[model samples]
Target chain A: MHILVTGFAPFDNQNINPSWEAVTQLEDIIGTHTIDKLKLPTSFKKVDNIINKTLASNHYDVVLAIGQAGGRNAITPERVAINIDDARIPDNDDFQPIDQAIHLDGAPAYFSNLPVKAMTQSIINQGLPGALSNSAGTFVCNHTLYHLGYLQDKHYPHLRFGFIHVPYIPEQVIGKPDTPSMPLEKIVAGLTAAIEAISNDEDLHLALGTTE
Target chain B: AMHILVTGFAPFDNQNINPSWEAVTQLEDIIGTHTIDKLKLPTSFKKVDNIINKTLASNHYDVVLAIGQAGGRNAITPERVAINIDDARIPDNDDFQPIDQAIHLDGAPAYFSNLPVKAMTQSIINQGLPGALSNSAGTFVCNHTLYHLGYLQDKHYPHLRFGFIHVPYIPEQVIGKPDTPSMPLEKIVAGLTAAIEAISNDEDLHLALGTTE
Candidate 1:
C-alpha cells in the first residue's frame, strides 16, 4: 500500500510548528507500505491546489493529513471535517475570513474513512495519549481535512482519508503558562503506532468513550 | 485642500487589538489643510480588494495610505514595492491561504509606492521616531492591498498617490514575549503623523534610502 502524509509549517507567533517536525521524522516504511510526505503551508488558498495536484499524480491507498493543535494535550484523530472556513486570526498571509464555506457544493460534513477508534486504541495501547476528537477547530486543519474527504468521495472512492492533530512540543510551551505539550519522542511514537494500526483494515469493537 | 484615506487592519490572529488601526485612527481629523479619513479594514484577501476599490470609486481622495501590523518589526517601515504574488505561509482571518498565486492575473510584475517614502522616513526620523524603507512587503494581504492600490492608481486614479506602511507591535501586545520588539503607541502616532505631513508636501527626498534586503 502507498500512503501520503502531509503536515503544516509554523504559523502565528510560534516559530516552530511540531506537526511538520514530527511528520518529517516518520519512517518511510510503515509495515509493508511506502510513504510520501508533504509539508504544506497553513494557508487555505494554496493547500487545495497543491494537495489536489499531488493526489492526481500519485497512486496511494491512504492519505493522512496532520496538523498542530496548541491546546490539545493528547494526539487526537479527527472524526469528521466540516465544509466551513471561519478564522479567528489572520493567517500568515494576513487573510481573515468569517463564516465562509470552503466548497459551495460540498456536503456539510464528511466522516473520515480511517478506522479512528482502532487508531486511537493502538496509540493508547502504546502507553501514549490518544483520543477521538469531534471538532477540528474550524481552521485550516479542518479545511484541509474537508477537502481530502471531498476529493475521496467525488473521485477516489477507494482511497482512505484521515487527519491527526498533535499538541505543542515541550519546547514550544516554554515560558507559556497553562499550555499543554507532549514530548517529541512520545508524539513520534504515538504517530507511528497510529499509522501501523491504520495500515490494517480490522475494526476494533471496543467501546472507547471519546468524551469524559 | 487634499483628501487622504488612511486604512488600517482590524484586530486579527487572536489578538484583541491591532497596532495599525490604533496608529491610523489617531490621524482621523484635519492635518495641515488635509482632511484625513480613517478606515479599519478586515484582514481577508477575498474581501479587502473589493472594499478598497469601492472606497476609491466613492471618494476623490488624492492620497491613500494603507497601514498594517508587522509584529516583529522595531520601527515604522514604508514599503518600496508590491509584487503580484500571494503565497501565504498562514491562512488569513477568513481561512484563505493562497500559495504562489498572482494577485492580479494580468497586472504588472510589481508596482512601486507612489508616496514620498524617503521623505516620510526622514520626517519620522526628524520627529525622533524610528523609520525605514522596506523593499519587500512579504506577499501577504499587506502586499496584496498595496499592489491593488498601485494598480488602481495606474488604471483609473492617475492623480492618486498611494503607499503602504508597516508598524511594529505595541507594548501591550508583547508583554509576555520580551524578545519581540515593540514601539509605544505615542511614538507610532508621531511617526505616522510625520509621514502624512511629508506626503502632503509632495516631494521625495533624494537620500540613499535603498536597502540590500
Candidate 2:
C-alpha cells in the first residue's frame, strides 16, 4: 500500500508547525506502505484544492493529514470531521471564515475511513500517548478531513483517508508553562507507528467492525 | 430587501456590556440584501418576552434572529432547540432567578429552530470563524427568549422563521479571566452576516417569504 502523509504549514502565531515537522522525519518506507509527504497551507480554500490536484495528478492508497492541537499530551487520530468550518482564528492567508461549509454539497459529517482505532493503538504501542479523538475540530483540520472524506465518497470511493492531530512541540509552549507539549522525535515516532498500523492489520481486525 | 428582526440581550449578572448587543450592533443596517432592525432587549425572562412579542406584533419580518452571550464558549453556536423551562443559575437583571420552572404549561415541552441550522453554522465557519450547533440554549433568559420565539412561530405566526445563536465573549471581556474563550467583535459580526445570507438565499426561505401574507 502506498501512503500520502500530509501536514499543514505553521498556523496561528506559531513559528513551527509540529505536524509537518514530525511528518518530515519519517522513513521513506513504513511496513509495506511507501510514503509521500506534502505540507498543506492553513487556508481551507487552498488546502483542499492542493490536495485534490495532487491526488488527481498522482496515485496513492492511504492519506493522513496531520494538524496541530495545542495543549494535548498525545498524537490523536480524529474519529470524525464535521461539515462546519468555524475558525477560531485567522488562517495563514488572513481569511477568517466565520460560519461556512467546507463543501457546499457535503454531508453533515464523515467518519474516518482509516482504521483509526488500530492506528491509535499502534501509536500507543510505540510508547507514546495516543488517543482516539471524537472530533477533528471545526478548524482547518476538520475541513481537511471532511473534504477528503467527501471526495472519497464522491469521486474516489476506494480511497483510504483520515486525519491525525499532533500536540505542540516543547518550544511552542514557552509561555503559560503548564500547557502540554511533546518532543519532536516522539511525535515522529508516533506518526511512524500510525502509518505502520495500516499494513499491520489483517482480515481479523477489519472484520472487527460490526453492525450492532 | 427582506425585513429581518434581530434581538440581543442587555448586560446581566452585574456585567457592564453584553457581547451579544455589542456584536449585533456591528452588523450593517442592510446585510446581504436584507433590512435589519436590531433590538437590545433586557435580560429578564419575563420582561424579554413582552418586548419581543410587542416588537414582532408591531412590525413584519421575514426572519427573526436572536443573539445571546455565552461565556467560556469558543465558538459561535447556533442553538438547535429551545426547551420550555426557566432554570437560571444566576439572578436576572430584575433579581429573579427561577429554578426548574416551566415556562408555559400550555406550550409544548420544546420547539425547534425553523432556520437552516447546519447551513447557518457552515456559513459562519466558511468565513474563517468557529461555528457549531448547540442542542440546548440553556435555561436562562436565552432559553426563555428562544422558547417564546419558537412558540410564537408555532402558534401565532406560522410563516415566521426564527433561531437563536449564542456568541462568545469579546476579547476585552476576558481581560481578567484566564483561558476564557472569546471572539473579536468584527469576527462575530462577519459570522452573523454569513448566517443571515445563507438563510436568506435558501429556497425554503424564499418560499416562506412568499407565503407570509
Candidate 3:
C-alpha cells in the first residue's frame, strides 16, 4: 500500500511551521506501506491546483493533510470540512477572503473517510495528546480538506482521506502566552503511530471525546 | 445635505480600547451640516464586510469614512489606496488566518480612496494636530474595509465618496510601553472632525502635500 502525507509551509509571520517539520520526519515505510511526503504551500489560491495535480499523477491508498493549529493543545484529527472561506488575516500572499464559498455547488460538509477515532486513540496510547475536532475552521486548512473530500467523492471513491492539525512547536511559543506547543520528537512519534494504526485498518471502539 | 457614515473598529489585538472608535463615536450628531452616523464594526474580515454592506443597503449615505487604529503611527493618517490582499502577522479575533487568498476573487487588483484625502490632511494639519498622507494602509481590516468601500461605490453607490483614516493609540493605551508614540484622544477627535469637514465640503482636492514623513 502507498500513502500520501502532505504538510503546509510556514505562514502567519512564523519562520517555521511545525506541520511541515513533523511531516518531513516521517519514515518512508510505515507498516509495509510506502510513504510519499509533500510540502504544500500555505496558499489558498494555489493549494487546490497542486493537490489536484499531485493526486492525479499517482495512485495512493490514503492521503493525510497536516496543518498548524497554534492555540490547540492537542494533535487533532478533524472530522469534517465546511464549504466557507472567512479569513480574518491574509495569507502569505496577502489574500484575505471574507465569506466566500470554497465550492459553490459542493456539499455543505464532508466527513473524513479515515478512521479518526482509531487514529486519535493510537496517538494517545503513545503518550501524546490527541483529540477529534469538530471544527476545521474556515481558513486554508479547511479549504484544502473540503477540496480533498470533494475530489475524493467525485473521482477517487476508493481512496481514504483525512486531515490532522498539529500544535505549535516549542520554539513558536516563545512570547505567546497561553499558546500550546509540543516538542518535535513527540509530534513526529505521534504522527508515525497514527499512520501505522490507519494502515492496519482496525477501528478502535473506545469513546474519545469530540472536544479539543 | 449630505449624509455621512463614519465607522470604527472594535478593540482588537489585546487592546482594551481602540482610539479610532473612541474618537469616531464622539463625532455623533455634528460635523459641518452632515448628519454624522456611526457604527462600531468587528475587527474580523468576515463580519466587517457584511455589516458595512447591510448598513449601506439601508441608508443613502453620501460619504463613508472608515477608521482603524494603527499602533505604531504617531499621526492621524489618511490612506490612499486599498489592495486586493490580506496578509496578517496575527490571527484576527476569530482565529481565522488565511494565506494568499484574494479579498475579491475576480475583482480589480486595487481601488483608490474616493475621499479627498489630500484636502482632509491639510485641514487636520491646519488645526495644529499631527496629520499625514499615508500610501500603505497595511493589509488589515482597515484596508479591507477601504477596498470594499471602493468596490461598493463603483458597483452599487456611484454617488458615494469613501476613504479610510488610521489613528494612533491614545496616550492611555500606551502608558506602560516606553518609546511608543501616542496621541491625545481630544486631538484625534479634532483631527477626524477636520477630515470629515473636508470630505463633506470638497469635491476635488488640489494640494501639493509632502508624501514623506
Candidate 4:
C-alpha cells in the first residue's frame, strides 16, 4: 500500500507553506505502506503534468495532496474541485490565469469519493482537530484536489484521492494581526492521523451525512 | 428579499485555473435564475476595487460574498476583514502594485461580515455538504475585494451584509504538472449557492468560531 503524500512549493507572497512542512514529517513507515513525498509547483499545467506522470509511473495507491491555507485554523478535508483559474493573488511564479478552465473541457465539478466523514472521525479520535470542507478556494489546493479526484475517476478508479489544507507556519503568522496560525507540531499530528484514517479505510465508521 | 454577492479569482499565478472563480460561477448557475444578481469579478488586485466600486455604484445589493484562491489548504474560510494593503508575493499582470499597499489612502478598520455565517455553515453541513468557517482572507486581491466590499457596506451600503469564500484547487489541476490544486466545479457551485441562499434568508446572523476537536 503506497501512500503518496504531496505538498506545494510556496506561492503568492508566502515563503513557506505549512502543508508542505507538515507532510514532510509523515515521511516513511506505515505498516509497509511507504509514504512517498513530492513537492509540487504552484501552476496548473505543471501540477497536472506532475500528477499524471507520477501516477502513471509510480502507481500510488492513495494520493494525499496538501497545501497552505494561510488564514485557516483547522485541518480541511476537501470535498470537490472546480474547473477554472482566476488568481487574485500573485503566485510564487508570478503567473495568473483569468476566465480560463483548469481543464479546457473538464467536468464542471468532481467530488472526493474518499470517506471524508470517516476520515474526520479518525482524525478527531486521534485527538486532532479535523473537519470535511466544502470549498477548497479556487487556488492551487483546489487545483490539486480536483486533478487528483479526476485522475482517479479516469484511470485509477479504485484509488483513494483526497486533499487537506494546513494553516500558515508560526513564522508566517508573525505580524499579521488578523490571521494567526497553529504550530507545526499540531499540523503534523493532524496530518498523521488523517493519513492513518485513509490508510485504514476507517471512513466507513463515520456515519454518512456527518461530513460537511 | 435579501441578497448577497460573491466573487472569486480566475486562474492566475503559476496555476492555470482558479477554483474560486469556478466555484462562484457555478454557484451563480446553480442558484438558477433567481431574483438576486450573481456577478463574477476578475482576480487581479489592480482591477478588483475599480470593478467592485463600479458595480456597487450601479446596484443596490443586500449582501456581498467575494471568493478567492488561497493556494494553501484549509476550509470554509470567512475572512474577518480586508486591509487597504497589497503585498503581492509576485507581480500582477498590470505590473504596477508589487509589494505595495492595495489602496492609496488608508482604508477603514476591517469590516466584519454581518451574514448568518454559523447558520449557513451548519445548514450546509447538516444537509450533508462539506462546509467550515474560515478566518483569514490573506492580503491578496480576494482580501482587497473583501475589505473593499466591507468598506462599501460600512460607508454606503450599511444595510448590506458581506463575506468572502476561499476555495482550494481541484486535485486534477495539480496532480502531475507542477503543484496547482483542483476542486470539482459542481460541488463548489453548490456550496457557494448554499451560502448565498443562507445569507439571503437570515439577514441578522453571525458566525461561531471554535476548534473542531
Candidate 5:
C-alpha cells in the first residue's frame, strides 16, 4: 500500500508553517511502500483543485493531509472535516469569500473513514502526545481533509483519509516567549505510526453515525 | 460608504503554491467594480494578526471578509460567525495561539457576522454558484482575524460587517499529482463579486455581541 502526504505553504504574515516543515522532511523515503508528498497551495481554490484532481486520478492507497495549527502543542488526529471555508485570518491569497461554500454540492459534513481513534491510540502508545479531535476547524487544512474524506466515502470506499495538526519546529520557535513546539523526529515518528496503523485498515469501526 | 476589506496571503514555507493569493487576485476581476480594498498577506500567523489590525486602522472598511484555500474541491463557503478562540492545530511563527480563550481582549458573545448570511447564500445560489454556511472559522489565524476585525468593528466601525470565506481548487490541478489545482481567475473573481454584492445589501446592525470577556 502507498501513502500520500501534504503540507501547507505559509500564509498570513508568519515566516514558516510547521506543517510544511514536518511533511517535507518525510518527502522522499526508501521503503517497501511508496510515500509521496503534494506541496499544496494555501488558498481554497488551488488546494481543492489539487485534492480533487489527485483523488480522481485513482492514485495513492490512503491520504493524510497535514496542516499547521499554530497554537496546538500536541499531535491532533482529526475526526471530521466539515464543508465550510470561513477564514478568520487572511489566507495566502489575501481574499475571503463571503457567504461561500467549500463544496457546492457536497454534504454538510463528513467523518474520516480512517481508524481515527485507533490511529490515535497507536500514536499515543508510541509515547507521543496525541488526541482525537472532534472538529478539524474551518480553515484550509480541515477543508482539504473534509474533501479528501468525502472522496474516500464516495469513490474510494476502501481507502482511508484523515488529517493531523503539528506543532512548530524547534528552530521556528527560537527566541519566542510563548511558543509551543515539537521536535521533528517525534513528529515523524507519530505520523509514521499513524500512517502504518491507518494503512493497515486495522479495526475500522464507526464511533458515531452520520446522516450523510 | 459601505466599506469591505478583503485579504489573501503570500506563499510561505515548503509550499510553492498559494491559492489564497490566487483567489484574492481574482476578486477584482469577478466583481464588476473594485468596491472592496483587497490586501494580500504573508503566510505567517503573526503577519495575519498584524495585517488585520493594519487593514482596520488604515481603511474605513465597514465589512471585512477573509478567504483562503480549503483544498480539493470547487465550491464557495460563507462563514456563519467567528468564535472567541485561537487554538492553532499547528505551530505558528510566534508559536501557537494560546488555547481555551477568546481571540480578542474584550470580545462579546460566541459569534459575530455582519452580512446577512442566509440572504447572501441565496444570492450565491441564484448565480448558480455552490456555497454553504460555516458555523465556526476555527480558532486559527482565520478565527483570529475575524475576532480582531470584529473587535475593531465593535469599537470603531460598529456598523461594519465582518465574515470569512473558504474556496476550493478547480478540477484540473487535482488531476495532476505533480501540480496544484487552481480556479480560473475569472470564477474566483465572480464568486467574490457575488459575495460582496450580497454583503453590501445586508441590513445594518447597530449592536455587536460576542462571547469574549
Candidate 6:
C-alpha cells in the first residue's frame, strides 16, 4: 500500500511549521506502506492546485495530512471536515474569507473515513498525549481535509483520508508563553506510532471523548 | 420499573422517515426493568419547547433521552455538551433558521450533559454497535433541543436527567446519497437499549475516555 503525507510550509512570521518538520523525518516504510512526502503552501488556492495534481498523478490508498495547532498541547486526529470556510485570518496569499462555502453543492460536512480512534491510540501507546478532535477548524487545514474528502467521494471511493494536528514545536513556541509546545522528535515519534497503528485494525478499549 | 422517556425528532430536510425516530420507536418495550416511552418531536423550536415541557409536567419520568439523525455520522454518538448558539445549516419544519442566536434568553454559553456519556458509549459498543462520544451536538436543532433540555433541568426539572444522542441514517434513507454512511435500524435500537441499560445501573464506570483539548 502507498500513503501520501502532507504538511504546510511555514506562514506568517514563523520560520517552521512543525507539521512539515516532523513529516519529513518519517521512515520511508511504515508497516509495508511506502510514504510520499509533500510540503504544501499555506495559500488555499495553491494548496488545492497541488493536491488535485498530486491525486490525479498518484495511486495512494491513504492520505494523512498534518498541520500545526499553535495553542494545542497534544496530537489530535481530526474526525470531520466541514464545508464552511470561516477563516479568522488571511492565508499566505492575503485572501481572507468568512462564511464562504467550500463546496456549494457538497454536503454540509464530511466525516473522515479513517480509523481515527485506532490512530489516536497508536500515538498514545508511544508515551504521548493523543486524542480525536471534532473540529479541523475552518482554515486551510480544514479546506485541505474537506477537499481531499470531496475528491475521494467524487472519484476515488476507495481512498481513506484524514488529518492530524500537532502542537507547535519547542522552537516555534519559544516566545508564545501562553502556548504549549512539544519537541519535534516527540512529534515525529508520535506520528510514527500513529502511522504504524493504521496497519493495526483494533481500536483502544478506552472510550475517548471531549466534553466540548 | 423506571420510566424512561425517549424522544426522537420528526423528519425534516425533505426526508420521508427519520432514522432517529425509527430506531428510537423500535427500542424494546422493557430494557432490563426500565419501561420505554417513545415520543416524536417536531423540528420546530417553538413547538419542541412546548411539547417537551408539557409532557414532563404531566409525566413522572426518570430519564429523557433525546435522539436526532446525523446524516453523515456512522456511529451511535452520545453528545457531551450542547452550546447555546443556533447556527442552522437549513430551515426547520417551521421554516425557522436561527443564525448565531442563543437557544435560551438567559442560559450559559454551554452545558455538559448529565448523562454518563462514556458509560453509554461503552454500553453501545459492548452490544456490537458502533458508538462514540461526540463533542458538538452541532449548532442546529439538535444543539437547540439539547441546550434547552439542560436549561430546563437547571430551572424547572431538577430531578430530570436529560441528554442527546445522534444516530446515523438507516439503510432506507441513503438510497441515492452516495458515499455516505448508514446503519441498520435494528442495530440503532440495540444501541439505544444498551445505553438505557447503562443509565439504569447505579453508577458509571471510571475510565480515562477524555481528550486534553
Best by lDDT: 1
What would the per-residue lDDT of candidate 1 be over residues B149-208, giving only the tens digit for each residue?
A: 988887888889999999999999998999788999989988988888787545566564
Residue B67 shift from truth in candidate 2, angstroms? 20
* TM-score of decoy 1: 0.51
lDDT of 5 by residue, B24-80 (tens): 766653243436677886655567777677666776765677876556434576666
Best by DockQ: 6
Off by over 4 Å in 5: A27-33, A56-58, A174-176, A200-212, B1-213
- Which TM-score values does chain B get in all models? 0.96, 0.92, 0.95, 0.81, 0.77, 0.94
Q: Which stretches of candidate 2 lie over 4 Å from their true place?
A: A199-212, B1-213
The residue-by-residue lDDT of candidate 2 on A37-65, one tens digit each, is 99999887798889889999889888889
lDDT of 3 by residue, A80-102 (tens): 67665656577778987755678
Per-model DockQ against the true two-chain complex: 0.02, 0.02, 0.02, 0.02, 0.02, 0.03
Interface C-alpha root-mean-square deviation, candidates in order: 20.2, 17.0, 17.6, 18.8, 14.5, 15.1
Across residues B127-161, which tens digit of lDDT does each residue of candidate 4 receive?
55566665345545666677787777767777777
Candidate 1: residue B32 lDDT (0-100):
71
| TM-score against native, each model | 0.51, 0.53, 0.51, 0.51, 0.49, 0.54
Candidate 1 lDDT by residue in tens digits, A130-198: 987655755788889989988887888898999999999998988889779999989989988888888
DockQ of 3: 0.02
Give the whole-model CA lDDT for all candidates, comma-separated. 0.81, 0.79, 0.80, 0.65, 0.65, 0.81
**Cα lDDT for residue B82, candidate 1:** 74
* Each model's chain A TM-score: 0.96, 0.93, 0.95, 0.90, 0.85, 0.95
lDDT of candidate 2 at residue B137, scale 0 to 100: 71
